[PDB]
């Protein structure tokens, strides 16, 4: 079963990306973005306990 | 039936609040601040997904 799919169109601002990452709660997460984008995406995940 | 409760007491840094407000904050969140402190906390919540 594939759960909700979230796309972070904005530049990780307005905390909507935080809302999308908080909505999903699973043991397996698939991330697909640029290197620099993932650099701070992982930091946001760490700050969100992911 | 009392659900899970997490108490948070810290400053406005260290990327707090959102660490625990992922699966325990679905319903009403209680704020225990003063006037200016509550204003700052609610500004941070507005800047976040709360």
Swiss-Prot record, chains A, B:
Localization of this protein: Cell projection, Dendritic spine; Cell membrane; Synapse; Postsynaptic cell membrane
Domain of life: Eukaryota
Outcome of substituting residue 33 to Y: In FESD; uncertain significance; severely decreased function in ion transmembrane transport when expressed in Xenopus oocytes; decreased localization to cell membrane; changed glutamate-gated calcium ion channel activity characterized by decreased glutamate and glycine potency
Notes on the domains: Contains an N-terminal domain, a ligand-binding domain and a transmembrane domain. Agonist binding to the extracellular ligand-binding domains triggers channel gating. A hydrophobic region that gives rise to the prediction of a transmembrane span does not cross the membrane, but is part of a discontinuously helical region that dips into the membrane and is probably part of the pore and of the selectivity filter.
Disease per UniProt entry: Epilepsy, focal, with speech disorder and with or without impaired intellectual development: An autosomal dominant, highly variable neurologic disorder. Features range from severe early-onset seizures associated with delayed psychomotor development, persistent speech difficulties, and intellectual disability to a more benign entity characterized by childhood onset of mild or asymptomatic seizures associated with transient speech difficulties followed by remission of seizures in adolescence and normal psychomotor development.
Similarity comment text for this entry: Belongs to the glutamate-gated ion channel (TC 1.A.10.1) family. NR2A/GRIN2A subfamily.
Function of the protein: Component of N-methyl-D-aspartate (NMDA) receptors (NMDARs) that function as heterotetrameric, ligand-gated cation channels with high calcium permeability and voltage-dependent block by Mg(2+). NMDARs participate in synaptic plasticity for learning and memory formation by contributing to the slow phase of excitatory postsynaptic current, long-term synaptic potentiation, and learning.
Subunit-level organization: Heterotetramer. Forms heterotetrameric channels composed of two GluN1/zeta subunits (GRIN1), and two identical GluN2/epsilon subunits (GRIN2A, GRIN2B, GRIN2C or GRIN2D) or GluN3 subunits (GRIN3A or GRIN3B) (in vitro). Can also form heterotetrameric channels that contain at least two GluN1 subunits and at least two different GluN2 subunits (or a combination of one GluN2 and one GluN3 subunits) (in vitro). In vivo, the subunit composition may depend on the expression levels of the different subunits. Found in a complex with GRIN1, GRIN3A and PPP2CB. Found in a complex with GRIN1 and GRIN3B.
Protein name stated in the entry: Glutamate receptor ionotropic, NMDA 2A
Biological source species: Homo sapiens (Human)
Organism classification: Eukaryota, Metazoa, Chordata, Craniata, Vertebrata
Shown chain mapped onto the complete sequence: 199 to 248 of 1464
């Amino acid at each position: 079963d594939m759960q909700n799919v979230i796309t972070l169109d904005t530049s990780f601002e307005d905390a909507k990306t935080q809302v999308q990452l908080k909505k999903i709660h699973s043991s397996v997460i698939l991330l697909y973005c640029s290197k620099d984008e993932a650099v701070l995406i992982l930091s946001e995940a760490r700050s969100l306990g992911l």
